[PDB]
Design a binder for this molecule. Sequence first.
Ligand SMILES: [Ca+2]
Ligand SMILES: [Ca+2]
Ligand SMILES: [Ca+2]
Ligand SMILES: [Ca+2]
Length: 238
Amino acid sequence: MDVAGLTDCGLIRKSNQDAFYIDEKHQRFFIVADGMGAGGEEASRLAVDHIRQYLETHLEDLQHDPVTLLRQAFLAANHAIVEQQRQNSARADMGTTAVVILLDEKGDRAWCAHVGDSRIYRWRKDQLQQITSDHTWIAQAVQLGSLTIEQARQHPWRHVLSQCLGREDLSQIDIQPIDLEPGDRLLLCSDGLTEELTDDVISIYLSEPNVQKAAAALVDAAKTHGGRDNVTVVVISV
Ligand SMILES: [Ca+2]
Ligand SMILES: [Ca+2]
Ligand SMILES: [Ca+2]
Ligand SMILES: [Ca+2]
């Protein structure tokens, strides 16, 4: 199992409010976060650090129930952000997305958890499947529907989140298992990737067996197409 990760300002933004973490020691979990609000940079850093620390501490005890483990990790992160909101008034609106992959000990089942509009994709025998459903008002519209015209981007938002970490009224944390097969790739990415690259283009770059090149190619391609935002990817080869 190989894994690569990469973040980039893009072409327009002056700072990077994304963050990510790869468990390089044991390759059990992987995190991407897309902050908003300077920062923004603080929210996404808090999310990544607290989810990581929570998982590091509680993985041995709770890996049998990863839904509880991941929910408690996200809430740990959420409160750490709110507590830094409750305190600091300038950074009172700060927030972030998060997407997390937690692998089971065996390595053939990946628990996918997210809040926001960063994505987890799985790639398998040239088929790219988006796993997570965007917490945006526009996505959940189409996902009923109607407004099924897509069509969806661009509207006013488009960019507006229906869920993010850093809100006291955080109820929805989406967690779902996916089964893994040798040869799969997992992609975690901020919307800076998917706002520039169609799913067809992404699938092309995830066909590259060398995950370092794949990740580098994905970021390079997102800048070529415009790079209007921070862009972060973690590419896992199963
Ligand atoms: Ca952002
Ligand atoms: Ca967006
Ligand atoms: Ca973004
Ligand atoms: Ca473009």
